[PDB]
């Protein structure tokens, strides 16, 4: 009745906590404590670093993460064994090992993204003859930040391979909501 142009997109409650303010989003390990951009911001405006810890862990918990289920009942045992059942020394050495492995896998993913840029240029030549031979740097950063679905990747690759159009990009993939199955999970 009161149709406001754009079809009303219902805004459901969030099911996952928003990612931390120290995150990178690129499979690279985050910093140890301080996210290193604070030094390029003014003091007493960096108050939102602890205001991320609050409302990421105390005051703005989504109610989909407070659901009690059989899977969460089982998973509490894993988390309890991790936190109060395993010594922090062994947790620290495992944390160092995971940090090194994640740095290595980030370097591997960065090299894979650069090779996908080269493949982007190749597929953009085969499909537009020889004219378009560039590649989309925004799509490169989109692949690096894991913002693309496999369907979007395949559609973009096919689009390059048979019409070119490097700077015509697929839509950004929405975040995956937390799955819920009644009392099971």
């Amino acid at each position: 009745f009161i149709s406001p142009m754009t079809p009303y997109v219902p805004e459901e409650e969030p099911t996952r906590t928003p990612p931390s303010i120290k995150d990178t989003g690129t499979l690279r390990p985050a910093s140890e404590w301080y996210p290193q951009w604070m030094q390029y911001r003014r003091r007493e405006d960096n108050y939102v670093f602890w205001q991320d810890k609050f409302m990421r862990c105390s005051t703005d918990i989504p109610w989909a993460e407070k659901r009690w289920t059989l899977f969460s009942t089982v998973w509490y045992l894993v988390q309890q064994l991790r936190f109060v059942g395993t010594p922090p020394a062994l947790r620290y050495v495992a944390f160092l090992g995971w940090r090194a492995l994640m740095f290595q896998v980030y370097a591997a993913h960065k090299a894979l993204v650069l090779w996908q840029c080269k493949l982007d240029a190749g597929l953009a030549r085969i499909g537009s003859g020889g004219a378009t031979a560039t590649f989309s740097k925004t799509m490169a950063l989109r692949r690096l930040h894991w913002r693309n679905s496999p369907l979007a990747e395949a559609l973009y690759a096919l689009n390059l391979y048979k019409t070119g159009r490097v700077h015509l990009l697929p839509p950004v993939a929405k975040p995956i909501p937390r799955p819920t199955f009644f009392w099971l999970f």
Binding site: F83, V84, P87, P88, A89, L90, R91
Partner: protein, 68 residues
């Protein structure tokens, strides 16, 4: 025998890596005092004035001081 003793030594080394209290949150279900955990209070029968002296001496010995 070395395998059995090695299992016991691995458990002891895990406890050594636990070491102290660091890394563990305080727990509202498990306070550090069993009198807190249960409901144990002294009442009218049993408590007497001299008991303060005896309590002082026991607390001095438990803290480790040779004064009374």
């Amino acid at each position: 025998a070395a395998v059995a003793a090695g299992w016991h030594l691995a458990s002891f080394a895990l406890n050594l890596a636990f070491w102290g209290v660091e890394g563990m949150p305080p727990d509202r279900y498990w306070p550090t005092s069993p009198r807190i955990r249960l409901q144990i209070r002294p009442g009218r029968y049993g408590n007497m004035d001299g008991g303060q002296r005896v309590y002082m001496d026991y607390l001095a010995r438990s803290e480790g001081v040779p004064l009374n």
